[PDB]
Amino acid sequence: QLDFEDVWNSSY
Amino acid sequence: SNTVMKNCNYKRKRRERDWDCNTKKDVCIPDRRYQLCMKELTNLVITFRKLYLKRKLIYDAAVEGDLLLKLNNYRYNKDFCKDIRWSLGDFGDIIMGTDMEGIGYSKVVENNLRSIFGTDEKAQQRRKQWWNESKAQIWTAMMYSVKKRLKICKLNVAVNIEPQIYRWIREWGRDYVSELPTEVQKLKEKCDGKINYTDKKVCKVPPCQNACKSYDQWITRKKNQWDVLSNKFISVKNAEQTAGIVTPYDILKQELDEFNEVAFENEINKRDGAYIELCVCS
User: Fold this and answer.
1) Nearest neighbour of A11 by CB, restricted to B63, B137, B145
2) Contacts of B5 in chain A (CB under 8 A)
3) Where in chain B is CATH 1.20.1310.20?
4) Residue of B58, B69, B91 to mutate, testing the A interface (most A Cβ within 10 Å of its Cβ)
5) CA within 20 to 30 Å of A8's CA: B6, B18, B147, B264, which one?
6) Per the record, what is the consequence of mutating residue 129 to A (chain B)?
7) CATH 1.20.58.830: which residues of chain B?
8) What is the 3-state secondary structure (H, E, C) of B43-61?
9) Residue A6 touches chain B, beta carbons under 8 Å
10) Is B200 helix (H, G, I), strand (E, B) or coil?
11) What is the CATH class of B1-160?
12) d(C-alpha B117, C-alpha B46), whole Å
């Protein structure tokens, strides 16, 4: 249920 | 791990399943490790292959982090920060190829990683390098839900690299310390005091006898787990330097608040005062 794009951009 | 989807959807409750020392004889595996979310790492078929790996790892890590937060009832506290640390560490060993579980889908992931970084005698160095470059971002990904969804965890401590056996001993110690008072409480409730002017209850009272048997079984598992883990530590240490840590006990002393080596060994060997008082007729 996690949005990959938001996760990717949040991880940096 | 013998499952791939389910463990990326929910986690068994804490200490629902004890450490497993039977699957691989020379190590004990915690249930958290068995359930580590690796769905994306599993189902994936140069500088770009590494990039695709990064995306998959980021996503598995964010899900793992979220599920660990949920396992902790969404409490943002020490238990959560430690779990994040343990799972991050395991991801690291998986990437580096120094993970000790090696069961089921973990073998598929290792094959995938060998397909990526190759298998020559400098591959291991490259994998360690890639991990060191990526680990901070992987930790950050695990904290995604805490940042975005939730309404004190320290990166530096989390990303600092140590052998898996060190970390598992820390996690084991914290489990032990949580379990002991609970198991003792169950004992006292049934076995405290005497059944007559002279005999402890355990001498004649079946509920107390059952309670001592259950405690015996629990403490026997703890002893076995410490035995296996502490010896894995020694064999790993002999085959590999960490300032401040010489013996497996040093890990417990540094991880735990109030550890005492003699008392601990008394406990796991059923010669501590409390156990004798409650469970030894004469």
Assistant:
1) B137
2) none
3) 1-160
4) B58
5) B6
6) No significant effect on binding to ACKR1
7) 161-282
8) CCCCHHHHHHHHHHHHHHH
9) yes
10) strand
11) mainly alpha
12) 8
For residue B81, what are the contacts with CB-CB under 8 A and spacing of at least 6? B152, B153, B154, B158
Cβ contact (<8 Å) for A11 and B145? Answer: no
The β-bridge partners of B200 are B194
Interface check B28 vs A, CB under 8 A:
no
Question: Residue B121 and residue B58: Cα distance in Å, rounded?
Answer: 27
Give the fold, CATH level 3, of B161-282: Methane Monooxygenase Hydroxylase; Chain G, domain 1 (1.20.58)
Q: Which residue has the tokens 């993970």?
A: B99
d(CA B85, CA B91): 10
Q: Is the distance from CB of B151 to CB of B162 less than 8 angstroms?
A: no
3-class state of residue B194 by DSSP: strand
- For tokens 């580096």, what's the residue? B96
Separation between Cα atoms, residue B25 and residue B27, nearest integer Å: 6
According to the entry, how was the structure determined?
X-ray
- B62 Cβ under 8 Å from any chain A Cβ: yes
Structure tokens at B90: 């395991």
What is the dihedral sign for C-alpha B152, B246, B170, B61? positive
Q: Label residue B127 left, alpha or beta by phi (over 0 means left) and psi (-120 to 50 means alpha).
A: alpha
Cβ neighbours of B186 (radius 10 Å): 14
CB contact under 8 A, B62 and A12: no
